[PDB]
Amino acid sequence: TPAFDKPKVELHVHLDGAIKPETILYYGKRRGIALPADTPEELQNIIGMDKPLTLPDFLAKFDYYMPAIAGCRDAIKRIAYEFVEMKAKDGVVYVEVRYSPHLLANSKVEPIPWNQAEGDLTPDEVVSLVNQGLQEGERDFGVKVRSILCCMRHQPSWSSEVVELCKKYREQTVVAIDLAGDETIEGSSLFPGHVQAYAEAVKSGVHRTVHAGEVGSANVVKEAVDTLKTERLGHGYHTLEDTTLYNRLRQENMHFEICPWSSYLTGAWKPDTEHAVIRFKNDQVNYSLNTDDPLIFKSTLDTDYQMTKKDMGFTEEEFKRLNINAAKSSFLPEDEKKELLDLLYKAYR
Numbered sequence: 001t002p003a004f005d006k007p008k009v010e011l012h013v014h015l016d017g018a019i020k021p022e023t024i025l026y027y028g029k030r031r032g033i034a035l036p037a038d039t040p041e042e043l044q045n046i047i048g049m050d051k052p053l054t055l056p057d058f059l060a061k062f063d064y065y066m067p068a069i070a071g072c073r074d075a076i077k078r079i080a081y082e083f084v085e086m087k088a089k090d091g092v093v094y095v096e097v098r099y100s101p102h103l104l105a106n107s108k109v110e111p112i113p114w115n116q117a118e119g120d121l122t123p124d125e126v127v128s129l130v131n132q133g134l135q136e137g138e139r140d141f142g143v144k145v146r147s148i149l150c151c152m153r154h155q156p157s158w159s160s161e162v163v164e165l166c167k168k169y170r171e172q173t174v175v176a177i178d179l180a181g182d183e184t185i186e187g188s189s190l191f192p193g194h195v196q197a198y199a200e201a202v203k204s205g206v207h208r209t210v211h212a213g214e215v216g217s218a219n220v221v222k223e224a225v226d227t228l229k230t231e232r233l234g235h236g237y238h239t240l241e242d243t244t245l246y247n248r249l250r251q252e253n254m255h256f257e258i259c260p261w262s263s264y265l266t267g268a269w270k271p272d273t274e275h276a277v278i279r280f281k282n283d284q285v286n287y288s289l290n291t292d293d294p295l296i297f298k299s300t301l302d303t304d305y306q307m308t309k310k311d312m313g314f315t316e317e318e319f320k321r322l323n324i325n326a327a328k329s330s331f332l333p334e335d336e337k338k339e340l341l342d343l344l345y346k347a348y349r
């Protein structure tokens with residue numbers, strides 16, 4: 001069944017949206033949280049979309065499982081660990097993965113997320129739990145993993161502590177910053193906390209990626225390039241509505257963070273339009289394929305490569321070119337990059 005079995009690189013996956021069902025019920029009960037169901041195959045069914053939803057509906061999936069993992073140290077540890085393994089199962093030689101460390105904390109975080117009242121688990125050891133899990137996940141599974149931390153659009157307060165965590169846990173294993181949540185909250189790229197965050201990020205050399213152009217306009221994209229100085233773009237579907245911005249982004253090789261299965265299920269793609277990805281194979285730009293949320297979209301990378309495969313005419317020669325593109329645009333230092341490059345050419349030959 002695989003649409004492409006060569007190795008692949010993936011650059012945009014959300015950790016807290018690639019937890020396993022089996023594991024969430026394990027924790028919801030062993031903590032007394034417990035949740036809408038008890039057999040794995042039916043819980044996956046209530047957390048999981050098959051059909052576009054609204055923002056509250058969507059947001060609410062997160063509401064069911066998250067309280068079962070945030071707070072618990074070995075819930076954190078086990079989720080990063082078990083993430084790597086899913087990506088090993090998946091043909092991936094290199095993954096980058098993101099989360100918000102605040103959204104898994106229960107100490108030193110106003111406000112406390114998901115209704116938890118307090119523990120002692122801060123943002124600081126959530127990273128480091130996560131990255132411990134990712135390191136012995138890497139080592140046991142032979143997948144090279146790095147991590148991105150995400151600022152949240154609605155919460156600029158948290159942003160200086162993001163840039164700061166990035167600097168601290170640099171290398172081991174964090175290599176970039178993100179902006180996530182809903183890009184639709186007016187003026188959000190321009191909130192002073194977010195922008196001083198991204199500026200500290202160019203001051204100290206932290207890589208940058210912003211979610212932009214999924215559901216919001218070409219001006220959130222524009223905001224992200226000219227102001228937040230992104231190096232890459234989550235989705236960016238809406239830069240296509242501005243053809244000088246599109247044309248200039250082709251000219252300077254934007255890397256675009258594509259997630260095509262994810263985008264039917266969200267709404268960002270109306271099925272009766274060009275999928276933005278296809279204009280993307282036709283115009284030969286710099287882009288990847290990406291799963292975004294396995295747990296919620298009931299998917300794996302193969303669902304994305306299948307979907308493109310048979311609905312959109314792509315071939316194995318574009319599937320390679322996109323993976324290499326991915327590797328080039330990854331946030332690896334250039335020595336490790338040329339080595340990831342090498343393995344990929346060899347494999348493709």
Ligand SMILES: C[C@H](O)[C@@H](CCc1cccc2ccccc12)n1cnc(C(N)=O)c1
Binds near residue numbers: 015150
């Ligand atoms: C970044 C994280 O990894 C979470 C954030 C979940 C969440 C929590 C609180 C407020 C939010 C507001 C908007 C969207 C998601 C939000 N997350 C998981 N997947 C996505 C996505 N598909 O874009 C966002």
Ligand SMILES: [Zn+2]
Binds near residue numbers: 012014234292
């Ligand atoms: Zn995303």
